[PDB]
Each structure stands twice: as C-alpha cells, then as structure tokens.
Amino acid sequence: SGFYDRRFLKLMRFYILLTGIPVAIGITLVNVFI
Amino acid sequence: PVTYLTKIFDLLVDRPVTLAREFIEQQHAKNRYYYYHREFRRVPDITECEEKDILCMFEAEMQWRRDYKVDQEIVNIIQERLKACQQREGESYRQNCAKELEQFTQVSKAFQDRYSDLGAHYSARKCLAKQKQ
Amino acid sequence: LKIIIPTTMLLPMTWMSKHNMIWINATVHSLLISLISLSLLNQLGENSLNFSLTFFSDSLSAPLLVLTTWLLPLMLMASQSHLSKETTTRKKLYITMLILLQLFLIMTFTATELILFYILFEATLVPTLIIITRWGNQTERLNAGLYFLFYTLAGSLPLLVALVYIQNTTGSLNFLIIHYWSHPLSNSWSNIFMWLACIMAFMVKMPLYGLHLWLPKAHVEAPIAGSMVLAAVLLKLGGYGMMRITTILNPLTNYMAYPFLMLSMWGMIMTSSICLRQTDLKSLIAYSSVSHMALVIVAIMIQTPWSFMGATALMIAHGLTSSMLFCLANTNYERVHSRTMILARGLQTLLPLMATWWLMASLTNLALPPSINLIGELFIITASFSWSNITIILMGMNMMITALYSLYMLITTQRGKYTHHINNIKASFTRENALMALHILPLLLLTLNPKMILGPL
Amino acid sequence: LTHQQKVLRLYKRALRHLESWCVHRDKYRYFACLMRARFDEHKNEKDMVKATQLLRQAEEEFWYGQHPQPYIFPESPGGTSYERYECYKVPEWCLDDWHPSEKAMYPDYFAKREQWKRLRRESWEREVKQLQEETPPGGPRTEALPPARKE
Amino acid sequence: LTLEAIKDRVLYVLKLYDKIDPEKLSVNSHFMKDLGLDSLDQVEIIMAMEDEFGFEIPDIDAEKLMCPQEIVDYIADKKDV
Amino acid sequence: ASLTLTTLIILTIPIMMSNSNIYKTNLYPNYVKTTVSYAFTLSLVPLLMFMHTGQEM
C-alpha cells in the first residue's frame, strides 16, 4: 500500500508551504520596496 | 554573415529585465531609510598596562582582536586581486601577475610572521611574546 | 536565564497535565522553547557573549545549546509509542527524566565556573542511568548501567580534585579570567599528572579507543530515548569541556599529545574495522560513533584553529546523524523484534520511504559533499596533515571503511529478498516519517549557513 | 545419491560445456555425437568397481576442459538476470493491509481473495491430521499425497 | 504464451528427434516403457527441448520428465501460464 | 554569462517537479527529454560566442 506515504508527503508539503508562502512573499515585498 | 547577430535577438531578452529593474528600482527610490559605517576609537595596548589589571588587558585585547580580524580581511583582498590578475591574462601571465605576486609575497610574509604558531586561544599577550622573540 | 526557566516550568505542566494529553503538552512546549533557544545563536564576532555573573554564551556553546534544546521533542516522538501500556504516573514520571536531563545540559553548556560546569557535567549521569536501567530491554542492561557509570566517575573524580587545586594555586576558577590570566605549566612531573588529571575525564566521556567499552554496551541496552541522548549529546559535551580546559595547559600539550594521538589515530581505523563485522545493527551504529569521535579528539589535541573549527562542525553533524540512525534502527526493532540485522532482509520491498531515509542517513554517515559532516571532517584532516604529512595515510583508510560498513548497513538490511514468514510489519506510521524528517531537514538546511556553526575560531 | 543419475549429470554438464566451446551449431553437433559415442563405445555396460574409476577419470578429464565460463541462461544461477525481478515479487499477505479506501477499488479481487483465505483457514486442521497420520516418526521424504481434500 | 502453444512446440520438437517415430508419438506417450530411448538419450531430448525456450531445467526435475504431458505441465508451472 | 548558468540551472527544475503530481503520472519523462533538448539548444550558444571571438569567463 502506497497510501500512508503519499499522505505523509501531502501533509508535510502542505505545512511547509502553508507557512512557506507568507514568508516568501513577505521577503519579496521587502525586496522591491524598503 | 555573422552568427553573433543572434545575440541581438538575445539582447531583447535582456531588455525585459532591464525595464523590469526600473519597475522595482523606482519604488526602491521612494523610501530610503539607511545605515552607515561604524568605527571604534583607539585604546592603549597591553604592553603598557600592568601585569595585573584585567581591564587594560581586556580593552587592549578586544582592540588587538579587531585588528587581527581586519588584517585577515586585507589578506583576503590581496588574494582576490591575485585571482583577478590570474584569470584576466589570456594565457600569458608571469606578467602583471608577477607584480601582484610580489606584493602578495611581502604581505603574506609579514602576516605569516605576526600570526603564525599562536595556536588556538591566540591572544595579544602571545603575539607580544613572539614579537620579543 | 530566560530559556532556562520554562524548561523547568514544563515539569509542573507535565505533572498537572491531563493523563492522556501529556505528550502533546510536552511536545508543543518543547518545540516552542526550541525556537526561543534559537535566538541565542547570534553571538558576536569578537567578545564572547555574556549574561549573568554565572553564565556566558561562547559561540562554541550556542549551536550545541540549540541542538540540545532541539532534541527533546524528538525523543518524545520516538518514545511515545514505545511505551503505552505503562501506568500514567509512571509515564509522567518518565518524561521528567528527559526534561530534567536537558535542563542539566542547558545549564552545563553555558557554564561559567568550571566547578559549576563540572558538577553539572557529572550531574547529568543520574537521569540517564535511571533511564538505561529501568526502561532498557533484556537483562544485560543492568550490567550495562555499571559500565556507563564508573567509567565516568573514575575519570571525573580526579578532575574534580584537580579543579579545586588550581583555584588555590591561582586566583579564581572562573573561565574568562583564567582565559586571560592563563600562564604556562611545564614538564616536571607534578605538572604532567596535572595534565592527565585535567584530561582523562573528558577523554573518557567522549569515548577513547582504549576506553570505549562501555559505550557499545550502553547502546545495546538503553531504550531509544536514552540512546539518542547518550549518543548525540554527552559525547559531544565531553568534547566541549575538553575544548574549554585547553585554555590552560600549553606548552605541555605539545609534549603529551602523542600517546593519545596514537590511541586515537589507530583506534579510529581499528574500531571502524570492528564496525565492518557486527552481528547486530544497534551496536554497529555505536562503533561507527566511536570511529567518528576519534577524529574529534585528535582534532582537539593538535590544537590548530582549523582543527577546532572542524571539531565543532563534526561534533554537531555526528550528533544528528547518529541519533538519526538510532531511531531509524529502532523502527525495525519494533516492527520485527529481530535486533539481529540478518532477519530484516528485504525490508525495502515491503515499504519504500524508510529506504529513502536509510539512504539519506547512511549517505551522510559516510559523509559526502557538502554535508556538514564532511566539511567538518576535511578541516581536521587538513590541520592534521599540517601537523604531520604522514597522517593522511591513516585518515584515508578511515574514509575507506566508513564508506563500506555504512553502505553495508544499507544493503544488508534492505536491498535483497524479503523474509517470507515475517508478517509482522505494518506500513509505517506518520510519526516515524515525521520524526526522521525532523532529524534530517535541519541537517541539510544547515549546510547553507555553516558560518554560524563553525564556532569561535 | 546414486551412481546412474550421477554419471548422467556429468553427461549433461560436459555436453553443455562442450557447446560452450564449439559455439557453432555445426561443430557442436558433430562433437556432441562423438561424445555420446564415447560414453557408449566405452563401458555402456560394466561392473561397478571399474566404473567408479572410470568416473574418477572422467571428472579429471572434464575439469581440465571445463572452460572458464559456460553459457548460462538468464534464469539460471549464473544468469544475466538471476533475480532481476525479485524487487517486485511482493508476498500476498502484504496487500492485506491496504485499508478500506484502497480495498474498495478492487471489490472483485478482494472478494475472491477472502474466498481463498476462508478456504485455507477452513482447511488447515485436515492437513494437520493427515500430516500427523501419513508420517512415521519422520523420514527423509517431503510432502504427502492428497486423499480427499486440500493436500 | 498459452498451453496449446507449449504442447504444440514441445511435440514439434519431439517429432524432429530421429529415435522417436513420429506416428507413435503421443502427448501421453510414455518414454521408457514405451519407446526404448533410454536415459542417455533422455538427457539429449530434455536439454535440447529446454534449449528451444531458453528456459533452464534443474537436474532433479530433469530426472522425472518421461511423459511429454508431464513436461508441458512442468513448463506450464514455471512460466505460470 | 547568463547563458551558461541557464544551461545548467534549468536541469535542476524537473527534480523539483519530482514532488509535484506530474511526477506520479506516466507523462513525466518526456518532459525530461524535452528539457534536455531545450538545454542543448541553449547550450550551443555559448560555444559560438566562444567561437569567432574566443572569449572565456
């Protein structure tokens, strides 16, 4: 069964990106302006 | 006909970013709160503070340490200029690179001298102890 | 003093926690306090950071401190399925050992008095003993307890008397001033015994090749939460202290290094060689650990600044990778109770992602670029090579065998046929993957920014 | 082991190495026929005590000529692919683990499968009693015949 | 591959062997009690027959052999058709 | 300058795509062959700027 692994990756990717987006975008906005 | 003309087409690919930079740089100009360099005043050295004051040894120690790190940075610079000369020659060198090689020889010589077998826990008292030697 | 209070504060929280929720409490707050620990890392480029009269935070300590704070949640995630049938009061009693332990670590890294540093250095011994003895499996653990114990004390006790001596022959025992007021001790015979007295304990706690015997026999026995600490940290702290006390000594170190450089330079190749033919995995990892610590100890004794840089880096990297291999082995041991490596056989066939972690972990065990393990190791080979051009011929053999057995543990317990009748395996829990991902990710991010891990020199 | 099957395996063996030398189907055919011609032309009938000596001769004569490496079919233990596919042959019990969101997707196969597993768990005591029955204290032979069910 | 293809290719090889007389050949036709071929030729027919497939015959299984049906059965097992 | 570094870096991207669902698809590899194709197409250019004028960097 490959379910448990893919689930794990779904979770992990989802969180690292969950917090991942606000941070990256924040860094970019800080780059272009201030 | 010249192949390199293709670069002109490729130049258009540069142009986009060029314009793009303005679209950033413009906004970057709009607000520019900014830093500037820090500097530290001179202090009397360990050689003249007495055998037991810790504060003299300490102030002078920090000064000596800053001076050391600085000197390392200078050797970094002279090496970088060395690399620059080396690549910059087409194939010749043993030329201007000999010129930099000389100043590097002197600099690395003296820097080798000031700061060699100090070992870990290098300390100004030791560089002194070497200088007297 | 800010990071240290909450670490105490989890204890009331643990005891007062609802009986079936405690793991969440301890986990969450341990993570938070890790993040608070991380702010310490800043240090300074010149002066060692200072705090209270009684603590300070050298760059040498900070990455270690961050690590030590970081490990608690991990041990929790590993433990919290290993035990379940245990009574609530007993479990609640159990995590207290762990956290009490790290509390002693956060105290013993920031030091500052070397007598305070000592008394904590030896205070660590109790909780780890209790853990090895009460929650280890199989009989031998009892005996193991003793080996773990006396080898520390028999080393530590003379160090203790020596410490007291110095603060009488000089002024304060405090580290900063002794770093400044330091004056050479030289030959004679009294001074030599001073030397061994101020070295042997530190060279026991990080195993030396002639003395390492307790360490495998600890790791064979301890429940994994004990294993992760006993491997990833205590060795490294013995190294931290030995890097501390070398502020004194000199020039005598130049004259006394040789015998220990022989036990180390030879013991590395030797133990690695024994490492090439173990019966069971849980030991294989342990000998790999000694085989790497020998590098640290020569790296300290040649005392060249490159060697201390490499010392720091290798200490941390080996910390994480060793703990990783241990949890990663315990998983098999729980799935099949084999312990012996031969029974696992074709484990890759039946499940994949663990094979991936085997790959990453072993892969950084052998140390290939640009793992902080590797870069940590290459420096000390550099400084060693400066110290003696011959020495490379020894180091190279290490880099041979550490390849082999490492890959070996991979290819023997994985690639190949499944054993037929072993139906016991049950397709990988989320916490498992979560755990080892937690080991290995920091280890890889960390390569991007070595400059914060290389330490004071 | 027994003598006849012994000399036979020596024959298939030697014959195969003989192909490994002769390469071409032609030459190989010729020398093959010559070879069997040797085995019959020699002592196709004889007393044993001489015969074993004839084997001891033959083993040497072969061992000298055995060729550094025979041709080997990939399935065979030499093999260019003796276990290329052992990566894949997952034992059945492992599927019995997929959990319902996967198990739903092959209702048919799983249905048939529980049919089987039922057949086994129902069957087993009979193989117990029969094995218990046909066996003496327990000789060299492996397995025993079916008599009314399962085997 | 299919069972008919196996039985067919097998007999199709047994037919070509000289010692067998093709009309007497039958899938169930016995190999020693019927046909006098003897083992020294049995080894030939078996190795030559496996050679057609590239398949490999283990020796102890080569000892049984005999009836061509037993053979087609055997390849049927090993190829799992 | 931008050219060579691009003729390297684009190779990295499919691995990044390895966690994306396209990797799980049968469809993935041809994106790779195409990827190396574009990589080559791009790869010729530095060689020619290297040709007639002979510059190195």
UniProtKB/Swiss-Prot annotation, chain C:
Biological process according to GO: aerobic respiration; electron transport coupled proton transport; mitochondrial electron transport, NADH to ubiquinone; mitochondrial respiratory chain complex I assembly
Domain of life: Eukaryota
Keyword terms, alphabetized: Electron transport, Membrane, Mitochondrion, Mitochondrion inner membrane, NAD, Respiratory chain, Translocase, Transmembrane, Transmembrane helix, Transport, Ubiquinone
GO terms for MF: NADH dehydrogenase (ubiquinone) activity; ubiquinone binding
Reaction(s) catalysed by this chain's protein: a ubiquinone + NADH + 5 H(+)(in) = a ubiquinol + NAD(+) + 4 H(+)(out)
Transmembrane stretches, start-end: 21-41, 59-79, 97-117, 146-166, 192-212, 223-243, 256-276, 283-302, 307-329, 350-370, 390-412, 434-454
Enzyme class: translocase
Membrane association type: Multi-pass membrane protein
The protein's Enzyme Commission number: 7.1.1.2
One Pfam family it belongs to: Proton_antipo_M
Localization per Swiss-Prot or TrEMBL: Mitochondrion inner membrane
Classification via InterPro entries: NADH4_N (IPR000260), NADH_Q_OxRdtase_chainM/4 (IPR010227), NADH_UbQ_OxRdtase (IPR003918), ND/Mrp_TM (IPR001750)
Gene Ontology cellular-component annotations: mitochondrial inner membrane; respiratory chain complex I
PANTHER family: NADH-UBIQUINONE OXIDOREDUCTASE CHAIN 4 (PTHR43507:SF20)
Function statement: Core subunit of the mitochondrial membrane respiratory chain NADH dehydrogenase (Complex I) which catalyzes electron transfer from NADH through the respiratory chain, using ubiquinone as an electron acceptor. Essential for the catalytic activity and assembly of complex I.
The protein's assembly and partners: Core subunit of respiratory chain NADH dehydrogenase (Complex I) which is composed of 45 different subunits.
Family membership noted in the UniProt record: Belongs to the complex I subunit 4 family.
Protein's name according to its UniProt entry: NADH-ubiquinone oxidoreductase chain 4
Gene (UniProt): MT-ND4
From Swiss-Prot, chain F:
Annotated gene: MT-ND5
Organism this protein belongs to: Sus scrofa
Subunit comment: Core subunit of respiratory chain NADH dehydrogenase (Complex I) which is composed of 45 different subunits.
Membrane-traversing stretches: 1-17, 39-57
Biological role stated in the UniProt entry: Core subunit of the mitochondrial membrane respiratory chain NADH dehydrogenase (Complex I) which catalyzes electron transfer from NADH through the respiratory chain, using ubiquinone as an electron acceptor. Essential for the catalytic activity and assembly of complex I.
Name by which UniProt lists this protein: NADH-ubiquinone oxidoreductase chain 5
Subcellular location: Mitochondrion inner membrane
Recorded family membership: Belongs to the complex I subunit 5 family.
